[PDB]
Design an enzyme around this catalytic site. Structure first.
Site, short mmCIF file in Angstrom:
data_model
loop_
_atom_site.label_atom_id
_atom_site.label_comp_id
_atom_site.label_asym_id
_atom_site.label_seq_id
_atom_site.Cartn_x
_atom_site.Cartn_y
_atom_site.Cartn_z
N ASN A 1 25.99 6.02 4.11
CA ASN A 1 24.91 6.99 4.15
C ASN A 1 24.29 6.93 5.51
O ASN A 1 23.44 6.09 5.80
CB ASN A 1 23.88 6.73 3.01
N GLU B 1 14.62 7.95 -1.07
CA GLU B 1 13.94 8.73 -0.03
C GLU B 1 13.58 10.16 -0.42
O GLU B 1 12.54 10.63 -0.01
CB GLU B 1 14.69 8.62 1.33
N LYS C 1 22.14 8.76 6.72
CA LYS C 1 20.75 9.26 6.60
C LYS C 1 20.49 10.17 7.81
O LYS C 1 21.39 10.97 8.15
CB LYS C 1 19.74 8.10 6.47
N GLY D 1 12.18 -3.04 1.92
CA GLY D 1 10.94 -3.01 2.71
C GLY D 1 10.28 -4.35 2.93
O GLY D 1 10.19 -5.16 2.00
N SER E 1 19.90 -3.34 0.58
CA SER E 1 20.37 -3.62 1.94
C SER E 1 21.74 -4.26 1.93
O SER E 1 21.94 -5.32 1.32
CB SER E 1 19.32 -4.53 2.66
N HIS F 1 18.48 9.93 -4.40
CA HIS F 1 18.20 8.85 -3.43
C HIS F 1 16.69 8.58 -3.40
O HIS F 1 15.91 9.50 -3.47
CB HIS F 1 18.66 9.22 -1.99
N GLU G 1 19.31 1.14 -6.71
CA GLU G 1 18.45 0.92 -5.56
C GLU G 1 17.29 -0.02 -5.93
O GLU G 1 16.39 0.38 -6.66
CB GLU G 1 17.94 2.24 -5.00
#
Ligand code: NA
Ligand code: NA
Lengths: 247, 243
Positions: free
Chosen positions: B8, B95, B10, B169, B206, B93, B163
């Protein structure tokens, strides 16, 4: 004097083949791109195909741009990415984004800031609803929407305003050219008030309500209407008549 | 079922960076009949990317419209994707859910539109830290999967992505595996054991060259949806962990 500006907003439409035929019929029109801007806005995944097929006299851009810059924003196209691709123009603020995708005045501001930082030219749309007009708040709503971004304009040739009369879109109401011209005059006044007479005189203000071969001349004649952001009618071969109306 | 490794990208890339990145990818000798490897560039980079990548690489886009063709400025319809022969879409996703207010109903409708147009889908879900802290991992993931899991027809063609928002984060491969097992149990209960053992479930936290082997070796982890690590030529080593 202002350069006229006729744009095709193809919205969410097109196949490889339909774009081949449509762009062929657009190329047949002679016009002078140093005198008139004619810009085609295809779907993002159609951009390379469209840009290759249209002759150089035509400008091109995309229908939206990210507020965020490069990085972890899945699904977004940054102003940096557009600049790298030499995409000349972006549309910001279109009412379909504000209606379906919760786009706010602050998003419009932040998108314009990003676009200008990356040397993109921006077609920025706003306009008032039926309820707002009926309440006699046209000028109040348009002032608010324009002051949301207008202080960012760094060059008045490179940001183009679009008046979208939402009160005459999907509502059964049709705006007369007089009504459209009145709002355009007020829009130019807001820019005069906030930015300066010379800047208001340079800026293009396009009409973004229903434009077709039949009404286009009555609109372009209006003193403060500098062109069009065209929807459905720009998916037709007869769009060339709309371009010719501004020639 | 085959492993599945997805890049991805992004909102990243230039024409020049994509040339060099795609050439490093083409240098990796792998068998696309044994492993799926999918690159998801930015919409405006898709044609550029698809042309530069050998056919062993499948490709897709990072989002797809819930609406068909028509008056939706800035959207790309499933019909348009199909006409361009775009193979995969990402749906749901975090995001999109976070920055663009994407909902479970948007996910279901986007999946319905993709399947209607013969696209294959990588569909993402996962729970926040607040949710995890309240013992809602299973409840949240259950709600999110049940939003769309009844649409899946061929279980090769919808790929699930966990996810771990609570960690973005990182989550341990052991922690990841415990979720993936629960996700598979969700598909078993709703779709059948045969189908749950067919469906790919990717880890979408990640992933990089430091942890990819530790994650793919977990029994219910079938590959990855890789973020920034996939913008690097070393992504070929993430692909090799699944070969
Ligand atoms: Na005029
Ligand atoms: Na595994």
């Amino acid at each position: 004097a202002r350069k006229y500006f006729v744009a095709a907003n193809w919205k969410c439409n097109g196949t490889l083949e339909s774009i081949k035929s449509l762009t062929n019929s657009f190329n047949n029109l002679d016009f002078d791109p140093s005198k008139l801007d004619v810009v085609v806005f295809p779907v993002s995944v159609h951009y390379d195909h469209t840009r290759k097929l249209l002759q150089s006299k035509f400008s091109t851009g995309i229908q939206n741009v990210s507020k965020f810059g490069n990085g972890s924003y899945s699904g977004e196209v940054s102003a940096e990415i557009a600049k790298d691709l030499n995409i000349e123009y972006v549309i910001i603020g279109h009412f379909e984004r504000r209606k379906y995708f919760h786009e706010t005045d602050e998003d419009v501001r932040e998108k314009l800031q990003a676009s200008l930082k990356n040397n993109l030219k921006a077609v920025v749309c706003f306009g008032e609803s039926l309820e707002q007009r009926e309440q006699n708040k046209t000028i109040e709503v348009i002032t608010k929407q324009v002051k949301a971004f207008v202080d960012l304009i760094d060059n008045f040739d490179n940001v183009i305003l679009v008046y979208e009369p939402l009160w005459a879109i999907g509502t059964g109401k049709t705006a007369t050219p007089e009504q459209a011209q009145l709002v355009h005059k007020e829009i130019r006044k807001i820019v005069k008030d906030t930015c300066g007479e010379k800047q208001a005189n340079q800026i293009r203000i396009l009409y973004g309500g229903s434009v077709n071969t039949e009404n286009c001349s009555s609109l372009i004649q209006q003193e403060d209407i500098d062109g069009f952001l065209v929807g459905n009618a720009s998916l037709k071969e007869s769009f060339v008549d709309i371009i010719k109306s501004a020639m």
